[PDB]
Design a protein around this ligand. Structure first.
Ligand code: CA
Lengths: 301, 517
């Protein structure tokens, strides 16, 4: 396939190539909670944080008094607001952390629950985050080890729970969506064994369903397996392409990895069969293979 | 005119499509069960959102704070008279199509066609006039619709809007989201379309029509906040005080017959539900079944066992399901020790920021608080409720472990179940097994609360009637009335039953009599 103009993107520990007109929405998660990129300028961020602290200070726990516990200084201008996680909570706090990349300033919000008896540990994690958050240009590929997010990367190669999910649409293929995810930890079962029952059920029930492909699909040293199905009903064609690397425990570069491409049911435009996502199964498989075969761990030093 | 009167439909259990909030990909688009494998694209939807998602992925993707309503689902405009584009704007693509699109389209066409050319139109001129008792109405206060009332109602333009919501989050927060939907999407449409000034806007009212847990969302909205915007409320199959089915599902998985599921064994369901305030809020409250037990430990002869103090092992024993069952970590608890591993599968407990059990116990305390507030706050003063009360649908109403707990309860107890309802194994026999009720020897006070609609035991379905709501329709074998002789309907599909539809339209007409103009 002609990848003229395709763009190599960094997501987490990985790289992937997408067409230049791809519409991309990404999310990044640390220890299970989203690290959200904020548009805030520094004065705006300060006002945002002060505003929230003062809101919390007006709120009351049902028995323990003030909902606001403390503002924590994580060093490197990063701060956290610590509050009870609810008005009846006794074992968990909400820790709302704000952190900036260096040396180019960008602001992030990373909020999640923390155990009362794990407070010091949570603090050290945020301290470390503030030390490790390095800025990068939107398409800059870091040669240093680390987990890439919007406008930055978390430098280092020490294990942490980390995950991303990226969703992609294609102007030329209405109704199609591609998604790419990584998550630390081995998935509990493997893709082919997991879905085969349901797929066989689909094939048996619906004459319009077919399996296009089922088996191994390694991409470099990534031991991926795939299951690709398509079907027709109501004069439109649907697709579900599934690819997975099971993952290894406590591994940043061998996490669980999934890639998927779907075309779900869409509607007729004023009583006319919806516009086709693809010209043919061959075209869909081509796009699928081209994207998946571009997935690789970001080379680092 | 125009005198618009919006009808806001609020869906129920797992009823709203969801996508990941950051990446926008689809993570929930029901039905996802083995039933009904009757539509090709439906099955693609289930494959993509559920079947190919591993257990860890499911736990990550069905996380309340990380999902949002997806309004891009399929829509069946049916005979509503709406274009797909219009129905899409109305949010009808937010919710399970088969379960909800038909009733939304029915109400739309019925309410758009009450009086024409000085005659009552179809259905309104006959079926609608039924004495409420014939339809299973049990409070005995409200009367039949009359010609006055329909003429009055015909002066308004009803439009059905679909308030899909993030069912994983607390229903407390979903109430806020529905408020925002009404105030920021629904009403501004009429402001612009009808050229309404701010006073006219302020004077507008809406009518809520809810399914299932959507009724708890509605009550949070009208009863825990000042929201006079709501003129009245129709509830269908509300688990007003919760449902013992949540215990079955968390300990055994959903049954194969279920259209919508969160797993096929304990670990799968528990991994999602035990982290979701919205899901856990379905758990029976302290007031459920008027405080009587619903979880029974029985011997081989079906007789309830005795505890250390010689008291029946029928829980709750002292009206506290939160401590007695939900946080209990013994073999009969909601999340026994054997199932702790499913609370947070992301890493070994050690490196985490929050302990899995810490989080879970705080969530239980949260639901207890929400349950308590809802109970005290009651129901909107113009509430018309209907529910399925049928003894041919056991609904896990009596949750029974039958067998000998002795080997499970000796010091250093280690025995594990099969995550599907039994401790019997290749290695051990005659042990506790979840079996279908009803209990062999029952409490006479429990007679009225037996059966249900498969998901909501009558215990909970009849709570609004017991709390004194204006109208309550008891549908199925445990109710009365000549128009109520069919077997009671099933929960998920309740709004596809003529009685549920009748009760909804009846409620709307009655509530409308209160509208100013
Ligand atoms: Ca209308």
């Amino acid at each position: 396939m002609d990848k003229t103009g395709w763009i190599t993107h960094c997501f987490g520990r990985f790289l992937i190539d997408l067409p230049p007109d791809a519409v991309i929405n990404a999310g990044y998660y640390l220890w299970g909670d989203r690290i959200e990129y904020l548009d805030d300028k520094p004065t705006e961020l300060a006002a945002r944080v002060d505003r929230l602290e003062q809101e919390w200070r007006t709120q009351r726990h049902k028995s323990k008094g003030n909902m606001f516990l403390r503002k924590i200084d994580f060093g490197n201008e990063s701060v956290g607001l610590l509050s009870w996680s609810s008005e009846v909570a006794s074992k968990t706090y909400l820790l709302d952390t704000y952190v900036t990349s260096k040396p180019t300033w960008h602001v992030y919000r990373w909020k999640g629950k923390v155990s009362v008896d794990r407070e010091q540990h949570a603090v050290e994690i945020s301290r470390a985050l503030a030390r490790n958050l390095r800025s990068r240009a939107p398409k800059e590929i870091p040669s240093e080890p680390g987990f890439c997010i919007d406008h930055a990367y978390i430098a280092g190669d020490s294990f942490q729970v980390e995950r991303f999910g990226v969703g992609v649409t294609f102007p030329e293929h209405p109704g199609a969506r591609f998604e790419f995810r990584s998550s630390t930890g081995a998935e509990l079962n493997s893709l082919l064994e997991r879905v085969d029952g349901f797929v066989q059920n689909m094939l048996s029930t619906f004459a319009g369903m077919e399996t296009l492909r089922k088996g191994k699909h390694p991409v470099g040293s990534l031991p991926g397996e795939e299951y690709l199905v398509a079907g027709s009903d109501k004069g439109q064609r649907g697709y579900t392409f599934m690819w997975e690397v099971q993952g290894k425990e406590e591994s940043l570069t061998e996490p669980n990895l999934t890639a998927g491409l779907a075309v779900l049911e869409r509607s007729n435009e004023n009583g006319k069969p919806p516009p086709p996502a693809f010209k043919s199964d061959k075209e869909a498989l081509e796009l699928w293979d081209t994207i998946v075969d571009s997935i690789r761990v970001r080379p680092t030093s | 005119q125009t005198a618009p009167l919006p009808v806001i439909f609020i869906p129920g259990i797992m009823g709203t499509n969801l996508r990941n909030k950051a990446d926008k990909s689809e993570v929930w688009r029901p039905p996802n069960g083995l039933w009904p494998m009757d539509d090709l694209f439906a099955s693609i939807g289930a494959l993509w959102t559920w079947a190919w998602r591993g257990p860890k992925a499911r736990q990550e993707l069905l996380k309340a704070e990380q999902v949002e309503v997806d309004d891009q689902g399929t829509i069946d405009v049916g005979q509503s008279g709406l274009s797909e584009e219009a129905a899409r704007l109305r949010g009808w693509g937010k919710v399970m199509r088969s379960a909800y699109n038909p009733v939304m389209g029915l109400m739309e066409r019925r309410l758009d066609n009450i009086v024409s050319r000085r005659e009552l139109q179809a259905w309104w001129n006959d079926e609608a006039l039924s004495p409420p008792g014939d339809q299973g109405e049990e409070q005995g206060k409200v009367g039949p619709i009359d010609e006055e009332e329909l003429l009055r109602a015909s002066r308004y333009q009803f439009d059905v809007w679909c308030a899909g919501y993030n069912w994983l989050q607390s229903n407390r927060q979903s109430a806020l989201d529905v408020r925002d939907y009404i105030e920021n999407t629904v009403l501004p449409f009429y402001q612009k379309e009808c050229g309404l000034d701010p006073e006219q806007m302020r004077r507008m009212k809406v009518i809520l029509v809810t399914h299932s847990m959507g009724g708890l969302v509605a009550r949070a909205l009208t009863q825990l906040h000042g929201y006079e915007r709501v003129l009245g409320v129709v509830h269908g199959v509300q688990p007003a005080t919760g449902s013992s089915t949540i215990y079955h599902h968390m300990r055994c998985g959903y049954e194969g017959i279920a259209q919508v599921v969160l797993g096929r064994n304990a670990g799968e369901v528990t991994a999602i539900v035990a982290n979701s305030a919205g899901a856990l809020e379905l758990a029976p409250s302290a007031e459920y079944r008027e405080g009587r037990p619903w979880l029974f430990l029985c011997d081989a002869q079906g007789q309830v066992l005795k505890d250390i103090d010689g008291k029946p092992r029928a829980y709750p024993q002292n009206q506290d399901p939160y401590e007695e069952i939900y946080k209990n970590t013994t073999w009969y608890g909601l999340v026994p020790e054997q199932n702790s591993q499913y609370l947070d599968m992301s890493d070994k407990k050690e490196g985490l920021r929050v302990g899995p059990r810490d989080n879970f116990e705080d969530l239980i305390d949260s639901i207890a608080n929400f349950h308590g507030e809802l109970s005290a706050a009651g129901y909107h003063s113009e509430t018309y409720a209907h529910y399925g009360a049928d003894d041919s649908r056991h609904s896990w109403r009596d949750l029974i472990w039958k067998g000998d707990p002795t080997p499970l309860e000796t010091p250093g107890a280690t025995l594990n179940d099969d995550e599907n309802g039994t401790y019997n194994s290749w290695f051990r026999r005659g042990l506790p097994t979840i079996v279908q009720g009803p209990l062999e020897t029952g409490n006479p006070l429990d007679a009225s609360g037996s059966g249900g609609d498969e998901t909501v035991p009558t215990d909970s379905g009849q709570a609004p009637a017991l709390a004194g709501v204006k109208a309550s329709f008891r549908h199925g074998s445990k109710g009365k009335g000549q128009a109520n002789t069919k077997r009671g309907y099933e929960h998920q599909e309740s709004y596809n039953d003529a009685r549920a539809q009748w009760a909804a339209l009846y409620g709307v007409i009655k509530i409308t009599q209160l509208a100013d103009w």
